[PDB]
Design a protein around this ligand. Structure first.
Ligand code: MGP
Ligand code: MGP
Ligand code: MGP
Ligand code: SAH
Ligand code: SAH
Ligand code: SAH
Ligand code: MG
Ligand code: MG
Ligand code: MG
Ligand code: MG
Ligand code: MG
Ligand code: MG
Ligand code: ZN
Ligand code: ZN
Ligand code: ZN
Lengths: 451, 451, 451
């Protein structure tokens, strides 16, 4: 019996039960959290990871929040480099909770944990069994398992290699699905988790999930010094989970979209296998095994299975008054996708598609703020399919036109919707051979306060 | 079991229960208060804050109403600078209640409270454990927790820094949502709390919630000495909560719209994290942690999650006979917003939208005095969406026109409505690095009366 | 259990129960009073005031009717200057009732009351504990509470200052709502209380609540010596409550529309807070706290919260044969206002609006004699809204036209209806800084009769 802080009548309960059939999920609502579903998924994921691994194993918790591991019988070594502004609060919460359980919880090594915390406070660079202030690449604690829970600030191959050279043979990554960033979308939603993310350039849009614009009265102006003739995704994105905001980097996010098999070639060499073991409406748990030596061959292909529909479409919005178009991604429940199979046989207008989608949403199966764009997406998709049926080609042929050179062109059709239906797979060519991994943050007053 | 002075059949009861799932909310109506909902929310909020914090903590109550902390087992130090015209009544009520419970309540430190009150009356500058006549920046009582309950007259960063340099590590702010003032609206409503606020310039309007106009026949006159060619929001706004009026300053209101993480850089430096822990139909409880030292990096982005729809729209009204347009904001129940998803797929006239909204309101889900403006808003929003669909742009392009200089302009489209649907987030760029905080009010007759 | 002399089936019972939730209101009809609702409200108001205040307090009763305080256990000092023509009757009734309970009621100080009455009859200037013949500004009895029950003949700031310099710190005012006289209406109704008031100039109208006209054939005559080219509200108004008539002065009526906070600056200075604690369909109880010393700042704004709709509209009537137009105010039940929200989305003729209002009135929710003008009002309001929608302006602009001078006029639109919907607030700028308060009525044989 695992108790999750979500509403009893919530429809995410069924999705969580299907995602974790080996547990008895029961709702025990105690707080009005606006990101309750994400926390519930993380809780169930760490429970599953603990179930899978050997009790005698020692687990590195990279980018840890130590207050969450303090009621765990497992042997966690929490790596806390204090690199984020929210970290001091987490460390203070850990210290307060340890003090509150100092002589009242017996078999959770609370005395050992407070001793290690005081030792790290005394000598910053000491490596205690349960705590340290180092990073993933500077910690010296050898272990058998590594866990990354909502860690997006590390390059995946470098961190994984640095764990592997320390004897780590199993790694676990819990996070948001990295597929929408492999498609290079400008903005997007994980609607089941009340999560909206956007490129920094489109934060002033009007109709995406995460934006804020102003009311204006029109001008042929807004002159600027930046010749922004092109609107393309840049590295910095903003995540909003419920109401908490997190900046992310696209390279770091995409690094965690690892292939099925890859090779880390350093002073030591490792053959690694990445596998998505849990997938619930945009939240995934990935298992990475690492074995010394080079074995087999790598194709460099990462595959995402779509239990629910995944949409990326073009949207026309108004950013700071200026009308632009950019790609927006979302997830659509598989029941909604199945109920639109017959409608998309014909060309449908976005208004008719929206009306049908609202009909299928009756309570609501999917969030309504994403219904318009989805409708638009579907409409475009339907039209494009007709185009393909209308302009049928010949087998074994590919029409090419010369351009007065030893080089030839052809026509690229317009594609305004990528629609991965339920039971399909996205396949992306990514790097699979990594060989270049060669590429003191606590203050005295915080030290005094922790004591 | 927490008892709230609201009607048993009130629909706000379900909203309060959802906002506070950790309590058993029971209606016990004893007075015909016209701002009963706001008082009920404040009561439940202080109960939640008391639940969260350690009993041995000492709590600064900034801008306190000491009569409300008098039946509390917690250790409150009430800071009462007596800068409001409603403060003498509150102090007299506190003294009268203390006298009425001097020898009837045993375990609430009533004797201590009367002793401290008499001590401050004797020597005004004395700093007693439970009472003082200083301000937030002149009080000397060190504490661990600070509470701001309906305090809008202080600059947030300066006050928080002055608490932090006194050892305060946790602060709580209970008050009306600051999002409508981040959008620079001229007038607005919190309809669930019977609250209407307006800029001082539009108090003579006709159809906003808080206004009063006269009956006129129409003249080509009203000549004035002030060249008012622009109608823009000014600093002073008027709040009417039920029937009690409060003047507010826009800058002080907006200062409390703090980012997720920020830095206070003074003689001491603090890394602070602001989090909205309670959000109920326009009334919020925010939790601010403060930790010494500078950690991490700040983006300067403040995020509001919209459980219910938030609307800002253009309204045409008559102020002192003169027809003008200004922005008006409001909150719309999420069920109403969901029920209008299908209708807003096409362009709808404001009259048809109003009739539909009246239909969905049957008892009433939302206040009727806001239905017209909301209807108008929806209509405009629908229209604008279609325009965006009609004038579709190209990906990665941004049309710009030169003006015989090293500058290029473009066309800014129409925005008469900002509609944040349920499960979306507003994101605003605000200051996150604060480093300039360097920027005796009791008379003898009141001293004699208090004794 | 409070018993009210009203009909058991009266619909005012529910309104009174909502206005006084702290009491059990039971109808005990004993007389066919035509102003039974007003008397019932006054009875419940004095009960609530008595409940609120400390039993050991001494209560000034300004402009008292001593027969009503005579079965009161509280310590009332009745101030009876005998300036009204209905006062000798009240004094005789008081003496008769005292005699009738001289040796039959033991614990109501009847012997003391008759002793004080005989003392004042002997020496008119003596200040006895329970009775005096002075005014509010000439009484010398110091007290802690003052009560004004249906007192409209005194300037509010001067009377309140004279009470405050006598140690009075709490004052209560029970009376008809002063909002209709802040809007400067010519005639009006409190229909729940069967009350109609009119300006003296329109007493000869035809279709207002309080008027009487004659039957005429119609002539091009009625010459007069007064160039009455203007019809404006003058000071004198006539109230008819049921069938009892009372002349009132507009200045004295409006003086009691006090701001939320104000300052009395005389030889002593007081900071006063006015708050409306009871509001029932036009009858209000206001609480005024007074504290010595000047504190805070005053805005000068008085706010009225509308639980029911408030209408002021232009009506065309026939006064003494001459067709004129003037403003008429009234209250509309909130259920009627809510049921007309959808209808007022479009332009509706007064006849269709009247038929709809008669339909919603089925027993009757509102008085029928007020339905026509209300209908007309709604119609005009609807039309005006359309105009505001039709003539949409630009944000941040205000069109002004020069007149060959350093002055610029503009166009003032028509306003034929002020409609304060339920859950709105009227805000009026009134005086809040008062500093100029510097601005023997019993005969020998009434004395002999009283003995
Ligand atoms: C550290 N972190 C956490 N999340 C997600 O946001 C949710 C809350 O993230 P949180 O760090 O605010 O949890 P907190 O310590 O405040 O404790 P709680 O409020 O009781 O939950 C988590 O469930 C994650 O799914 C995160 N999401 C992104 N994109 N980036 C991050 O760094 C990140
Ligand atoms: C001090 N203050 C209180 N409020 C809100 O108005 C409501 C009443 O505010 P109040 O100060 O009038 O309460 P009072 O002391 O009269 O006791 P009560 O009548 O029994 O409640 C509160 O619930 C607040 O939500 C306030 N609202 C604004 N905008 N500004 C303020 O300063 C302010
Ligand atoms: C003194 N006075 C009383 N009223 C209202 O008129 C009603 C009756 O006023 P009343 O003075 O005629 O009561 P009376 O002494 O005759 O005893 P009763 O007939 O049993 O009630 C009261 O309920 C008041 O609401 C009053 N109304 C106005 N406008 N002016 C006044 O001076 C005034
Ligand atoms: N290079 C690095 N090596 C190890 N940890 C790092 C790191 N860069 C950032 N981090 C840490 O990663 C953390 C992400 S916040 C993590 C919260 C916690 N893991 C949870 O499950 O809720 C930050 O606290 C930051 O300190
Ligand atoms: N600079 C300042 N420092 C501390 N308090 C201040 C202040 N400026 C104004 N105040 C106080 O803030 C109060 C707001 S009224 C507060 C009422 C009370 N907190 C409640 O919960 O109902 C006023 O009484 C005023 O005295
Ligand atoms: N200046 C003044 N000071 C005190 N009382 C005054 C006054 N001017 C008029 N009054 C008194 O106010 C009274 C209004 S009739 C009041 C009736 C009584 N208060 C009731 O509740 O029914 C008159 O009797 C008149 O004598
Ligand atoms: Mg959150
Ligand atoms: Mg497998
Ligand atoms: Mg109020
Ligand atoms: Mg949080
Ligand atoms: Mg009568
Ligand atoms: Mg109040
Ligand atoms: Zn380590
Ligand atoms: Zn202090
Ligand atoms: Zn007297």
């Amino acid at each position: 019996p695992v108790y999750v802080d979500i509403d009893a009548d919530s429809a995410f309960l069924k999705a969580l039960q299907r995602a974790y059939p080996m547990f008895e999920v029961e709702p025990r609502q105690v707080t009005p959290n606006d990101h309750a579903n994400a926390r519930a998924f993380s809780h169930l994921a760490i429970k599953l990871i603990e179930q899978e691994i050997d009790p005698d194993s020692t687990i590195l918790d990279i980018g840890s929040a130590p207050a969450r591991r303090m009621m765990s019988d497992r042997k966690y070594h929490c790596v806390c480099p204090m690199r984020s502004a929210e970290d001091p609060e987490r460390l203070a919460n850990y210290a307060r909770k340890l003090a509150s359980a100092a002589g009242k919880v017996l078999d959770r090594n609370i005395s050992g944990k407070i001793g290690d915390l005081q030792a790290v406070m005394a000598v910053p660079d000491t490596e205690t069994p349960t705590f340290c202030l180092h990073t993933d690449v500077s910690c010296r604690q050898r272990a058998d398992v590594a866990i990354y829970q909502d860690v997006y600030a590390v390059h995946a191959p470098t961190s994984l290699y640095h764990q592997a050279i320390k004897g780590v043979r199993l790694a676990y990554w819990v996070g948001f699905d990295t597929t929408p960033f492999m498609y290079n979308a400008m903005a997007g939603a994980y609607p089941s988790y009340s999560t909206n993310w956007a490129d920094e350039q489109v934060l002033k849009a009007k109709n995406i999930g995460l934006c804020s614009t102003d009311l204006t009265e029109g001008r042929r102006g807004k002159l600027s010094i930046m010749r922004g003739k092109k609107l393309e995704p840049c590295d910095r994105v903003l995540f909003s989970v419920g109401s908490t905001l997190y900046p992310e980097s696209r390279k770091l996010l995409k690094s965690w979209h690892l292939p099925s098999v890859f090779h880390l070639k350093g002073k030591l060499s490792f053959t690694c296998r990445c596998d998505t073991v849990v997938s619930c409406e945009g939240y995934v748990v990935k298992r990475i095994t690492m074995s010394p030596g080079l074995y087999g061959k790598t194709t460099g292909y990462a595959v995402t299975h779509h239990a629910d529909g995944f949409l990326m479409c073009k949207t026309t919005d108004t950013v700071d008054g200026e009308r632009v178009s950019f790609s927006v991604c979302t997830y659509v429940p598989a029941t909604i996708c199945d109920q639109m199979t017959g409608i998309l046989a014909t060309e449908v207008t976005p208004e008719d598609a929206q009306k049908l989608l609202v009909g299928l949403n009756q309570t609501n199966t999917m969030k309504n703020y994403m219904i318009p764009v989805v409708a638009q997406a579907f409409s475009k998709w339907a039209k494009e399919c007709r185009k393909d049926m209308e302009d049928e080609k010949l087998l074994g042929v590919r029409e090419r036109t010369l351009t007065c050179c030893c080089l030839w062109a052809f026509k690229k059709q317009k594609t305004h919707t990528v629609y991965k239906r339920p039971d399909t797979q996205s396949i992306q060519k990514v790097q699979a051979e990594f060989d270049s991994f060669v590429v003191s943050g606590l203050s005295i007053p915080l030290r005094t306060r922790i004591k």
